[PDB]
């Protein structure tokens, strides 16, 4: 909790943490069992995608600095 201040930057945060946890046990489900592959990569990796996106924005270096 870097941003106390602003409760959307935590819910931010929130979000992020929950999506990447999401993907995580995604990925262990995943590890744990042509372009279905890819599709199902992508599945288990929508909360990694999720986290990175919530993480580019609360960080602000992969949507401050670009789009």
Same mark, same amino acid.
């Given at each position: 909790?870097?941003?106390?201040?602003?409760?959307?930057?935590?819910?931010?945060?929130?979000?992020?943490?929950? /999506?990447?946890?999401?993907?995580?046990?995604?990925?262990?489900?995943?590890?744990?069992?042509?372009?279905?592959?890819?599709?199902?990569?992508?599945?288990?990796?929508?909360?990694?995608?999720?986290?990175? /996106?919530?993480?580019? /924005?609360?960080?602000?270096?992969?949507?401050?600095?670009?789009?």
């Amino acid at each position: 909790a870097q941003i106390t201040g602003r409760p959307e930057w935590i819910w931010l945060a929130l979000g992020t943490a929950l /999506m990447g946890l999401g993907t995580l046990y995604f990925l262990v489900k995943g590890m744990g069992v042509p372009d279905a592959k890819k599709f199902y990569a992508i599945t288990t990796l929508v909360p990694a995608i999720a986290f990175t /996106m919530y993480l580019s /924005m609360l960080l602000g270096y992969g949507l401050t600095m670009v789009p």
